[PDB]
Amino acid sequence: PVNYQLTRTANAIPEIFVGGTFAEIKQNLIEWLNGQNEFLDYDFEGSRLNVLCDLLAYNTLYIQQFGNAAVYESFMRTANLRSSVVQAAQDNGYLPTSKSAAQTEIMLTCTDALNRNYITIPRGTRFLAYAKDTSVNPYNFVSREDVIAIRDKNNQYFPRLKLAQGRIVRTEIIYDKLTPIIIYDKNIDRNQVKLYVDGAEWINWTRKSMVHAGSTSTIYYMRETIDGNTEFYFGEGEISANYIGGLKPTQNSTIVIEYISTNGADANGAVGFSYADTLTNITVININENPNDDPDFVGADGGGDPEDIERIRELGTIKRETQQRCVTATDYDTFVSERFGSIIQAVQTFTDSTKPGYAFIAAKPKSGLYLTTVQREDIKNYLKDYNLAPITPSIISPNYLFIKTNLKVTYALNKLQESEQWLEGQIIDKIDRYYTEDVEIFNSSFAKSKMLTYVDDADHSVIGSSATIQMVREVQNFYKTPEAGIKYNNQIKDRSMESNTFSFNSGRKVVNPDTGLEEDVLYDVRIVSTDRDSKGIGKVIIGPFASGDVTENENIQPYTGNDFNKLANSDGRDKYYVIGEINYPADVIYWNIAKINLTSEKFEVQTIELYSDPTDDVIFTRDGSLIVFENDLRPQYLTIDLEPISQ
Amino acid sequence: VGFGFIAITLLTMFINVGLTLKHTETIINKYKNYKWDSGLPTEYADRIA
Amino acid sequence: MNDSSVIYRAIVTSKFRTEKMLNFYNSIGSGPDKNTIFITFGRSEPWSSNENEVGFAPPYPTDSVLGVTDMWTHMMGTVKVLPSMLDAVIPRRDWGDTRYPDPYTFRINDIVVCNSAPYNATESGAGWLVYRCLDVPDTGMCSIASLTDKDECLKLGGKWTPSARSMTPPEGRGDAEGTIEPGDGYVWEYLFEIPPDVSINRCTNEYIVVPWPEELKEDPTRWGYEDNLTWQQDDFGLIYRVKANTIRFKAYLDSVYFPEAALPGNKGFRQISIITNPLEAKAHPNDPNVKAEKDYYDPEDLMRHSGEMIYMENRPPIIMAMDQTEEINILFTF
């Protein structure tokens, strides 16, 4: 820096601990043993009084680890060995989500023979789901909560509910007050637990679904006691509450714990569900709609497995900055996290200045792309209870920039074993592992060279690799684009930004053979961003047109020339219409088809890709827009060539 | 997380003037002076060379 | 505060010390707004058992009203300080006198006087011409204050004792624009005029007078301008260029104005203050009130503790016998 007083240091283990390399210990002991003290009178020997020095140095280098390790795992940031880490994270009010279970919301169409109104659908209601990898075997599902239905018009019910993965288990115990009640099994999401004490309720403390202002006692506690087996216990209370604390049981009670077995994260597949329902006259009519909400759906979400060590720490210390409340942008990031986490990979919450209130939250699920709903409304509620009262949280989701690879790994036929396929898929996750590690998160770029070094790491036989690249960014509403929106953040390499597909309708009738007629739904269109010019300029065009439908007037006169503005391949009769700006140096796209004044009904479905290729090799990011590649959901752009070599 | 947060600047000089003003030394010297009243001297001293 | 991230630098320069002084004198005048000044005289009480002697000293006064109140108890009479009597001064270094330690020399920026005396007299129809100051020391021979030496180290360091004498330090009125450099080095920059009449009157063995602006701007050629093209640069006035930065006023205490008090034995014990803007007796208390414009008010008629006391001093005996006037010089840097 400038002024030397700013040097300080980061977290630094002082020279007091550190610990021996051996022979340096031999050096310091000899100087302390021979010198300053004795000037040997030793009766052993010339060599023995020497030799015996390191015989007690191995005693030091030993006791300088066995007993010196404690201070390493005593603190947090410097500790290793999970157990100490976790156990020291609860006094920061965290807990590390030992495992997780899949969750969806399905709407059952069923009906009853009794026709009775207000049919119920109790807690368990065992379902089973393949969570498809191919077909064979189910897992399990349980609704776990309540709901209700209503009969309307025709006699049917829509008892839409939500469901967790595992089954349930209930172990009742007599409280001895000397007996640290626990579980022992490798399971039991702490997110969803009940734990009645002989009456009901006992909403505990560490995790609220309500927060039930006041309500005093009846809380309990859940921590760790290392070992993987969760600890339950109760406060210091008396209730002869006395003043403040947990109600405590009284010396003998039936304590009924019920948890969810949570088979594991293997269940992310979801898709087809079956009733498996035996209760009463409910028919279980099926027509089960797994995703009746909104756009594209991955199946279930969550599934957990225990959090890694490098995760906990970062979330362990930051929760001292908060106390069980979110007033700050960095707080929502910690509240959208292992509490509600495993359903969200990254957040970066922010507040827009033009629109007060309304804390905006970008989130990417591990399932990829969009959170759908009711997994969003769920994130909504869990915040607003701990939130800053007037402002309402909202989930916008980030603005996704994917990339189109088209890479070729060029292996050698000699050294393979499983040959193609298995390697075709082995290259997938390695690429996928690159995203998840480096560029999955915000503000981070990626370099295709770094993707290729994980590509070349596939197994052995793959030698060399290479790719073209295109940055794909898909518009939502289309037809317009927002005001000064739709920006790559990178240099666009003009003569790029190529269309997608589109289509047309109308165009009079144009009857065809066979049946009566058609709507002339063929003859598509597509957009091209043309050239650069004196500074930015460059315009853009909507696409190929034959004749007829448009409003020409004086303001259109469709043309860019036979110059660049490359041509779509069809009959198509050219006559490209000018539409919008696209300033190159500061990356901006602008369309507003209303310039040429067509009808939106003449266009097919919106949400069209555009995908210009980048100028520079490395692709940057800003303004809360991720670059993350997820294959399994959208295969549409990934293409790889295995073209081999025979030696 | 819900508020606009704009930054603006203010500057405070704190000019320290008012040091010194120490009045330095004050000096006065008496006079024997001459009015037309005058009257008898007692002897004389100096008065020319 | 301390050790802030941002660190700023502020000179306050010199001129503020002077310009602030000018505003003081710029209203001494006559009227309701012009806050005239009054000096004042002292105590009759023997003040102690050891009173007349060299050792020991009056007790240090106190700014508290408990000390403000005892003056008006122990005070007799107040001479007034006119606007004309107060004057701004400079240490008056002069070349050629043997009495003061260093005859010529006068390192770097210093004020000289000559033509004031037997030794320095030259070209005298003008009396004291000489407030001119030295622009540059002469060539080499400066061994300055530290180790280094050469015409360099004035910049990284202190002041030059040139070690060489000066000769013909008289000078003309000056060169056009920039001023004369008669001898070897010792360039001289001519600073105003100082006619003889004001000299013998308002100068002294120590210091010297500089005119205020509103005089010179009013009248060149008495104090002798129109030689200076740099005048029209920044209006007349120049108390700044001299870097006057100090003000003294004086007062004549004549035992005639205070015939009481001045009797065979008056001991005039300490206490000699200053004050501002007093008021008249008022006759009976209910009335309007007037600013006090008449010289040598008696202690009574002043509305005890009228105005605010701006200064304090204790000089243990003085004398104050009849027919011996008393001249008080007090010097402030404001």
Side-chain angles (χ1 to χ4, degrees), chain A residues 513 516 523 525-534 536 538 540-551 555-556:
Chain A
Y523 163 71
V525 69
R526 69 178 186 84
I527 63 100
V528 174
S529 63
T530 66
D531 283 338
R532 189 174 296 107
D533 190 3
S534 63
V540 64
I541 56 101
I542 184 170
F545 283 83
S547 64
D549 295 344
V550 278
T551 59
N555 290 337
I556 286 93

Side-chain angles (χ1 to χ4, degrees), chain A residues 630-635 637-646:
Chain A
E630 296 302 321
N631 189 30
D632 189 7
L633 178 59
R634 291 180 180 172
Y637 42 89
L638 178 63
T639 58
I640 62 174
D641 291 344
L642 267 66
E643 177 67 13
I645 298 299
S646 296

Side-chain angles (χ1 to χ4, degrees), chain A residues 327 332 351 357 359, chain B residues 1-5:
Chain A
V327 297
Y332 297 139
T351 183
Chain B
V1 71
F3 292 161
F5 171 69

